[PDB]
Amino acid sequence: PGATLCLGHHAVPNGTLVKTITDDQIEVTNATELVQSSSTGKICNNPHRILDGIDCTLIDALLGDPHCDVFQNETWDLFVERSKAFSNCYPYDVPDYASLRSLVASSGTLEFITEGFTWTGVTQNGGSNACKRGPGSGFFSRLNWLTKSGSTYPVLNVTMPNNDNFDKLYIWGVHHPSTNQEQTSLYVQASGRVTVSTRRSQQTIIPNIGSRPWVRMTSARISIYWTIVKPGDVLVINSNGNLIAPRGYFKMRTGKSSIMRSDAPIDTCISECITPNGSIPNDKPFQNVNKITYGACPKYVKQNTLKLATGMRNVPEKQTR
């Protein structure tokens, strides 16, 4: 009269299907999800400095559209641009808009330092009813619209050295009148010119006279350009008409700043990882929420689920049922 000693392993009533080398589906006792597929729908306000653009694009905040004056000197880790944003100043274009937006976004600041440019023999601080500031006409806060004084617009020729130990970003522009009458009336000369240069490089823009589509009372336009001046270099601005002059420079930084397009609301919580859909947890190695992300984030993948087996093969007792 002996004894039986049986070796065995557990099983569970509710197993999970996982994938392996040999099986597209096979049952194990437990598994864990490696793909983050949901978000709260809200951008957590910590630990990153989130700046909500509200009605303003970064570029409009940069130029100083009046309804974006609240953004003066602002800083951010992530600037959030909303789909409701609008421009409400002189109509403009930026050749290479995407690059200017990118380099400012990445710098993370709109810190502006006014410099004492001397514009001899021209009228300063031009404005327009296209860009109302209070009840009267106005303009971009960081730009200075120069026009004739008396009946002359002389060759402007000014310099600003960079004797600081940081890079200066200058934003300037060129005005494109709708008609020849407007050109001569504002700048005297029949064809203007703007040349902005450093020791190393130079840009020359000739204005083009003609109507563009009427936007906020005007068929004329401004084109926006930028120039970076490094320590020890010097900015020279030379023009016989059509200059939209800088008032100073923006300070450039390097670091972790960026920009994101999202309509998600900002809320009180903590999350390292931000998507346009909202913050997501970063405990899993992968995510399927959005390929656009900011911060310490799971990597984007196409799968909406991937199960890592956390148990043995689940073998229930066969039944006659």
Binding site: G8, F286, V301
Partner: protein, 172 residues
Amino acid sequence: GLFGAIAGFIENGWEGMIDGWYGFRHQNSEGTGQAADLKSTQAAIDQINGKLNRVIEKTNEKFHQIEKEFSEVEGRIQDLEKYVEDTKIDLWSYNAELLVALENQHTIDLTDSEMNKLFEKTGRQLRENAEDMGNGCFKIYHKCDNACIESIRNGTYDHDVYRDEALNNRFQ
């Protein structure tokens, strides 16, 4: 699995064993019973925790990147931006698919392996006093009361004590 214990020579698992992953069932003179083996259970859990912690190890922090959605048709630069991102996503999706497939095959094999290690360990403990029935059970050829069973389970079974009794019962 590679060792042929789980879903192999062991017909099935035990839903009744809620206090361990591997363990023992016995029939003797005093009745039937069940006990978890803690050592085998812990070795499997430790290995699985180890791989889980390696897999969820945070390694990715990105700040300013490229744009990935576009409101205008632009041509060549945008084609390239999209192709770069699409390429990246496909490579990462593949890595994710491969990783889980390899991890899961290995987890199934290591758990099968731990079953087999316990079985082989128990066989070696019982020397000539038992025989392998082929279904995960040993026929033990002697009076093995509850204290004797526990002695097998906690590694204190002296096979010499019962050898003569068992040898006689085995060879007729």
